[PDB]
Design a protein around this ligand. Structure first.
Ligand SMILES: C[C@@H](O)[C@H](NC(=O)O)C(=O)O
Ligand SMILES: [Mg+2]
Length: 335
């Protein structure tokens, strides 16, 4: 019996946010916008309400949730060992950055953290998310709003495809600004570790952290063992049709001929090269490509074609993050 309430992204109707806060108080799951992707959230201190997130997403128990906060004072409650990183955190928060810390809070149950001694924490730069958290009065545990393994919802149409009739409330604030999930950095080890590339660019983190480690699974998508964050273990971001990622574009002639029943996801500058194609954005504006990629995967899988074929991009700036997503999605990679 799902309700969809439109709110302004800058000054949302506090009445809609109070309705959402009341649902959260009742141990219900709601869907809300951020600057990255839509989230599906519960009271972070409510065990049974956080289990409902796992059940609703068809999500493996060992994939932990990000705890969304609105103030530095809430970070003092839920984490420890962060005092040396506060100057850093204050430069990027609120914003599209998630950090892994040692868990303090007795109050955040093991289901949220997948029984790990660490917690993933984000302060999102979206007035709707910040105002909801503050009105509700507890942190919100929220993964991406999508069935697990599917592309992350960046607008209410995608949320509706996955969750109509399954959640009481969806707050609609339109297309998310970035269209890609937060950068994840582990700050619990001697050297900081990138776990998921995102809108906070690898190049920027390397300026601040010369010793930043970038593990193989970030450049390949191939992690086994116990994941410390979202977006590491399992198939992700995947359309309902086989995804062929083409890193080496000189084989694009050969791929199209090997997989005849195709639609191509391509850039504006190569649009008049393919008969059937979805234009995801321009190479002159890489943020356009990040903004639309999950959308493009969802249109593409509805074109009644057997195979979705995607152009590769430079492993640089925001396109690093795009390629990480496409590699975790791809049924085949032509390199
Ligand atoms: C809901 C949103 O904040 C998202 N969550 C996730 O991908 O698990 C992110 O980190 O950008
Ligand atoms: Mg996700």
């Amino acid at each position: 019996s799902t309700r969809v309430l439109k709110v302004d992204p800058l000054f949302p109707d506090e009445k809609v946010l109070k309705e959402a806060a009341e649902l959260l108080r009742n141990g219900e799951v709601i869907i809300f916008p951020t600057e990255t992707v839509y989230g599906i959230g519960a009271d972070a201190y409510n065990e049974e309400a956080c289990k409902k997130i796992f059940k609703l997403k068809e999500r493996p128990a060992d994939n932990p949730l990000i705890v969304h906060i609105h103030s530095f004072k809430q970070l003092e409650e839920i984490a420890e060992g962060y005092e040396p990183h506060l100057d850093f955190l204050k430069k990027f928060w609120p914003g599209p950055l998630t950090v892994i810390f040692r868990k303090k809070s007795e109050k955040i149950p093991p289901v949220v953290t997948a029984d790990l001694p660490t917690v993933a924490v984000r302060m999102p730069a979206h007035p709707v998310a910040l105002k909801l958290i503050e009105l509700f009065g507890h942190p919100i545990a929220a993964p991406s709003a999508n069935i697990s393994g599917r592309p992350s919802a960046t607008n209410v149409k995608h949320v509706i495809e996955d969750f109509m009739g399954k959640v009481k409330l969806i707050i609609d604030a339109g297309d998310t600004p970035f269209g890609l999930e937060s950068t994840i950095v582990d700050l619990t080890k001697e050297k900081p570790v990138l776990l998921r590339p995102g809108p906070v660019e690898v190049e920027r983190l390397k300026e601040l952290f010369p010793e930043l480690v970038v593990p193989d699974f970030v450049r390949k998508g191939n992690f086994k063992g116990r994941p410390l964050a979202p977006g590491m273990k399992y198939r992700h971001y995947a359309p309902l049709k086989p995804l062929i990622l083409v890193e080496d574009l000189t084989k694009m002639e050969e791929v199209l001929k090997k997989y005849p029943d195709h639609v191509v996801i391509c850039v504006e500058e190569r649009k008049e090269l393919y008969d059937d194609r979805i234009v995801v954005g321009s190479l002159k504006n890489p943020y356009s490509i990040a903004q639309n990629i999950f959308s493009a995967l969802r249109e593409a899988e509805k074109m009644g074609k057997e195979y979705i074929i995607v152009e590769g991009f430079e492993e640089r700036g925001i396109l690093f993050a795009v390629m990480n997503r496409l590699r975790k999605a791809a049924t085949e990679i032509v390199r």
